[PDB]
Amino acid sequence: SMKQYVARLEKDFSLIEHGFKEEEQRALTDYKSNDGEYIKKLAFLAYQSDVYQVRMYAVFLFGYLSKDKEILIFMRDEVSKDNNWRVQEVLAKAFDEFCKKIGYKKALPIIDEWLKSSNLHTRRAATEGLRIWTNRPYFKENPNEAIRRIADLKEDVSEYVRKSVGNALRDISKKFPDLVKIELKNWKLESKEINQVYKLASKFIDA
Template identity: 75%
Template structure:
């Protein structure tokens, strides 16, 4: 298996932009190996110093995320990765988990990640589900999406607040009145809230 990782490092390190090749390779390997083998592969790959190989690993973790241990590893360990590209894949893998078990069934996990002490975990939850109201359950229950997103409008992390503003702006295209009603309740004297407001209100007339 070490030889496989070495080959991945050689091939994937040549990719400088995007994530499609890592995603395609991960899905192919997930479909053609046993669960135990691919789980071992994912953990070995995640310890690579090559960030593209870690991206590949996190895609695998997403496909394996019905395993509680994997989901916890995503939440508590992958969120600490210092490469922003890996964090983008974490968001995609969280959405993969929600898609696998169903978005309504995932609500307790969504709420758990919402309260995480690590900002990258909170951001992955917000960013991964964009556009929230295009997702099952939230499409029919937009207020369930909005109330969860706005709970982080004063988040200490500017990256999280940016995701909050962008996620609300997404929703405002289909549900402008719901977003306007929410934004009208905000105190814009607060610097953090005002930052989110500027992003969220872009399409509100």
């Protein structure tokens, strides 16, 4: 029956070539209408699908279920291995969902853990998923707590991470130009990595 339901999701979703709202809405409905211990089993089974759109659905479920530390660890360490970039985009959204549910201030230790993780996809999920960082609670009132955390990744080894880092600072610069200017002025523009991030972050700054 659970297997039958995964088979129905595969039929429903496998031909979708763009977007994520259909998978998201189905996950939200299923999360709200069933007990969490059952939905955890469904999420793990769906995440094993060879249909990446069903894995997207499963990762939305993980986000809704992420108060359970075992689900959050599976997101951090296993979903981050997914070879499909659309699933990676859903991982970022599911991480934002975790932070929204617990509260952004209460989530800071987990944010910091993901930003320091060994898997570049874990680091990127946190940097990208919270964009625009200063539109979220806590960061909106404390913008330097976002700027400092993002700027710490300006030397990241991964280009995928660095693009998210630079664009996350670019977002913030449009509403907090004074604070981003102060941060950028302190950078020593030596490495290839930091120069890539600096160019993205500085477009709207009168340096």
